[PDB]
Amino acid sequence: MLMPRRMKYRKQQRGRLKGATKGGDYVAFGDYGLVALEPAWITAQQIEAARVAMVRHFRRGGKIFIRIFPDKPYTKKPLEVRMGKGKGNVEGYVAVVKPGRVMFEVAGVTEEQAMEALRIAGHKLPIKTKIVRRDAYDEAQ
Amino acid sequence: ARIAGVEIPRNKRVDVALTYIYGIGKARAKEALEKTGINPATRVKDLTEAEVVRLREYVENTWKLEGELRAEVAANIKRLMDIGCYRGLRHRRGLPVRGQRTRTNARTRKGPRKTV
Amino acid sequence: QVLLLPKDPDDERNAFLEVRAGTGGDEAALFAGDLFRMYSRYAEARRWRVEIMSASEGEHGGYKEIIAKISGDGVYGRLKFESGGHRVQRVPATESQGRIHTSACTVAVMPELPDAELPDINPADLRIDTFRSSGAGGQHVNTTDSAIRITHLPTGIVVECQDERSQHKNKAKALSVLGARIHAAEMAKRQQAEASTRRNLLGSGDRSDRNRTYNFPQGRVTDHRINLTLYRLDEVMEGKLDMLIEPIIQEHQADQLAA
Amino acid sequence: FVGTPAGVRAGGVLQEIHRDILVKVSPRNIPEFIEVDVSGLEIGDSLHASDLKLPPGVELAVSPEETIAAVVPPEDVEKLAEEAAAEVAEPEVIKKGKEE
RNA sequence: CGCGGGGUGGAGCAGCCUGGUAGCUCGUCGGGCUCAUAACCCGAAGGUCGUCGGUUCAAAUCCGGCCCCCGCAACCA
RNA sequence: AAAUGUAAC
Ligand SMILES: [Mg+2]
Ligand SMILES: [Mg+2]
Ligand SMILES: [Mg+2]
Ligand SMILES: [Mg+2]
Ligand SMILES: [Mg+2]
Ligand SMILES: [Mg+2]
Ligand SMILES: [Mg+2]
Ligand SMILES: [Mg+2]
Ligand SMILES: [Mg+2]
Ligand SMILES: [Mg+2]
Ligand SMILES: [Mg+2]
Ligand SMILES: [Mg+2]
Ligand SMILES: [Mg+2]
Ligand SMILES: [Mg+2]
Ligand SMILES: [Mg+2]
Ligand SMILES: [Mg+2]
Ligand SMILES: [Mg+2]
Ligand SMILES: [Mg+2]
Ligand SMILES: [Mg+2]
Ligand SMILES: [Mg+2]
Ligand SMILES: [Mg+2]
Ligand SMILES: [Mg+2]
Structure with missing residues (x-):
């Protein structure tokens, strides 16, 4: 699944989840988008489950665009160790997602297909989502 | 590269030395030394530059030699x-x-x- | 005659050829090398990758064992009739009288079934039992449970450990030994299945029994399955023979088809 | 985008890279659209702004190398199996110090 | 999960620490002795140095991350 | 001070 091919540093501080998205808030490729309504670290497991959910609905046809990428390493200490002795090991990677980001985009597909695929994909994600379609507001960006 | 592109062995009889050219054997050696009237037994160190350019001019025009022959x-x-x-x-x-x-x-x- | 009724898998897959000496000693091993050269002369005659993966040469030549992987389309379907004991009657390479000795060799033919490496510990079939350990440790052995005791419900293997103090260090060794028996018990039932099959094809009757006999006196290459006798040993025990297996393949259709 | 690309007939998808184009033109001269013939596009062929037939009085304001449309292969469940069993090499860390 | 040792031709080992040349034994191949085999004699072939990297002008070698393997440790309740 | 040669006169 999705993870950086290489990195400068193995482990990354957790940071914060303040505010609306920095960017990526408008539809830029497909006809419909799935927009995040609340902040979270989205795992590559969740991303790929949403993706597979969409292609397995389309069955054959369409095009999916994944606009978030999990580049942030996720760290966890081995089970049953005490505090200290350094930072835990990297167990996975997450994509930081804040309210308003277009996470996925679909094209080449009917409206009802796009509505249904993105809905099922929303059920694979740990946040509330909203389905949107391309607008003049999007094109004007 | 005296003649004819190759520097033929000095200290050797001109007929034998001429064979060190690609395209000239013993047969063509006795040929060119007659038609230029040069003693075949004389050593290449003992040739006259008259005889050199004499032997040269004939040999380089009668037969195809070295590079052009290989080609x-x-x-x-x-x-x-x-x-x-x-x-x-x-x-x-x-x-x-x-x-x-x-x-x-x-x-x-x-x-x-x-x-x- | 509508040859289009019976079905068979494996016919197109890839086959192992295990040729071994039988009755005869060093001269028998010699003829095991003569047989392999034939399956190598003929596997080239349809363009089949014949790999050699195990063998044991005879002292005077040939092969005490020789095991090969013959790859290509239709490998097993062409060669499945070569399994058994092939008999020879010839003047050995080890006798100056010229007395004729009747030896035999054996051939195994197995199609490869997408081999192995597949199972891995999935939880729906595991009931894990936790409780308190047994022996020294003080009031901690008394109170903290920490003795993991798993039970693999489909296979029945129960490996159960209490060595390190934490049940999670104990969980690790419990899982890491269940696999060592899920794999051990499957690899047995597959190699127990590999010796029940092979023992039949080769047949202990390698004195003189099953398939073919090759006359070097008069050149009568004969297959006792049907009867068909011929003099093509020159053209067969020195090259290919894809056409002289055809009656053994054709008479084996009408064997199954007509009944 | 006038026409149905033949790649679309073969199962593909027309990715509409640009849905408009940047242009210098007079206000008295504003066209309503610019038609583009995409029916010739296979999987996977592309059109650029150089291929645009411009109406009179309108001048391209982007580089003609700018790509404007493409016909891409579709999503396919048949590929899911290889993608799920595709093993990924763990990320390499870029070396610092006496390693670089 | 700690600690410290290893992966180098087909098999078994050396080469590292003081970087530039990969060697030893058996084995494999071709030739001889013998009626023939072994043994013996002559000659020859054979290695991504577990990987992913890069240090250095230069890595089997030095230095990191990973994948295996070996030994030890895992105590006071 | 140097081994072996099975199995159909
Ligand atoms: Mg923090
Ligand atoms: Mg999380
Ligand atoms: Mg963390
Ligand atoms: Mg603890
Ligand atoms: Mg504590
Ligand atoms: Mg810590
Ligand atoms: Mg941690
Ligand atoms: Mg994770
Ligand atoms: Mg975001
Ligand atoms: Mg949700
Ligand atoms: Mg912008
Ligand atoms: Mg000459
Ligand atoms: Mg055996
Ligand atoms: Mg007790
Ligand atoms: Mg006590
Ligand atoms: Mg307790
Ligand atoms: Mg040693
Ligand atoms: Mg060693
Ligand atoms: Mg030899
Ligand atoms: Mg290393
Ligand atoms: Mg070196
Ligand atoms: Mg004590």
Whole structure:
């Protein structure tokens, strides 16, 4: 699944989840988008489950665009160790997602297909989502 | 490169020295030394520059030598190889061409033995 | 005659050829090398990758064992009739009288079934039992449970450990030994299945029994399955033979088809 | 985008890279659209702004190398199996110090 | 999960620490002795140095991350 | 001070 091919540093501080998205808030490729309504670290497991959910609905046809990428390493200490002795090991990677980001985009597909695929994909994600379609507001960006 | 592109051995009789040219053998050696009237026994160190340019001018115009000769032989082989004749095929696979036996021998064409 | 009724898998897959000496000693091993050269002369005659993966040469030559992987389309379907004991009657390479000795060799033919490496510990079939350990440790052995005791419900293997103090260090060794028996018990039932099959094809009757006999006196290459006798040993025990297996393949259709 | 690309007939998808184009033109001269013939596009062929037939009085304001449309292969469940069993090499860390 | 040792031709080992050349034994191949095999004699072939990297002008070698393997440790309740 | 040669006169 999705993870950086290489990195400068193995482990990354957790940071914060303040505010609306920095960017990526408008539809830029497909006809419909799935927009995040609340902040979270989205795992590559969740991303790929949403993706597979969409292609397995389309069955054959369409095009999916994944606009978030999990580049942030996720760290966890081995089970049953005490505090200290350094930072835990990297167990996975997450994509930081804040309210308003277009996470996925679909094209080449009917409206009802796009509505249904993105809905099922929303059920694979740990946040509330909203389905949107391309607008003049999007094109004007 | 005195004559004719090659620097023929000095201290040697002119007839023998001339054979050190690609395209001139002993036969053509006795030929050019008659038609220029130069003693065949004389050493190349003992030639006159008159005789040198004399022997030079004749030899370089009567027969094809060194580079131009190599160019033709190759083209002659290049043609047989391109027209796809049996003679050509043998040249393309580096095998003997004059109907020689190849179960044994053929070492001059084939090269030293490749173990198996 | 509508040859289009019976079905068979494996016919197109890839086959192992295990040729071994039988009755005869060193001369028998010699003829095991003569047989392999034939399956190598013929596997080239349809363009089949014949790999050699195990063998044991005879002292005077040939092969005491020789095991090969013959790859290509239709490998097993062509060669499945070569399994058994092939008999020879010839003047050995080890006798100066010229007395004739009757030896035999054996051939195994197995199609490869997408081999192995597949199972891995999935939880729906595991009931894990936790409780308190047994022995020294003080009031901690008394209170903290920490003795993991797993039970693999489909296979029945129960490996159960109490060595390190934490049940999670104990969980690790419990899982890491269940696999060592889930794999051990499957690899047995597959190699127990590999010796029940092979023992039948080769047949202990390698004195003189099953398939073919090759006359070197008069050249009568015969297959006792049907009867068909011929003199093609020159053309068969020195090359391919894809056409002289055809009656053994054709008479084996009408064997199944007509009944 | 006038026409149905033949790649679309073969199962593909027309990715509409640009849905408009940047242009210098007079206000008295504003066209309503610019038609583009995409029916010739296979999987996966592309059109650029150089291929645009411009109406009179309108001048391209982007580089003609700018790509404007493409016909891409579709999503396919048949590929899911290889993608799920595709093993990924773990990320390499870029070396610092006496390693670089 | 700690600690410290290893992976180098087909098999078994050396080469590292003081970087530039990969060697030893058996084995494999071709030739001889013998009626023939072994043994013996002659000659020859054979290595991504576990990987992913890069240090250095230069890595089997030095230095990191990973994948295996070997030994030890895992105590006071 | 140097081994072996099975199995159909
Ligand atoms: Mg923090
Ligand atoms: Mg999380
Ligand atoms: Mg963390
Ligand atoms: Mg603890
Ligand atoms: Mg504590
Ligand atoms: Mg810590
Ligand atoms: Mg941690
Ligand atoms: Mg994770
Ligand atoms: Mg975001
Ligand atoms: Mg949700
Ligand atoms: Mg912008
Ligand atoms: Mg000459
Ligand atoms: Mg055996
Ligand atoms: Mg007790
Ligand atoms: Mg106590
Ligand atoms: Mg307790
Ligand atoms: Mg040693
Ligand atoms: Mg060692
Ligand atoms: Mg030898
Ligand atoms: Mg290393
Ligand atoms: Mg080196
Ligand atoms: Mg004590």
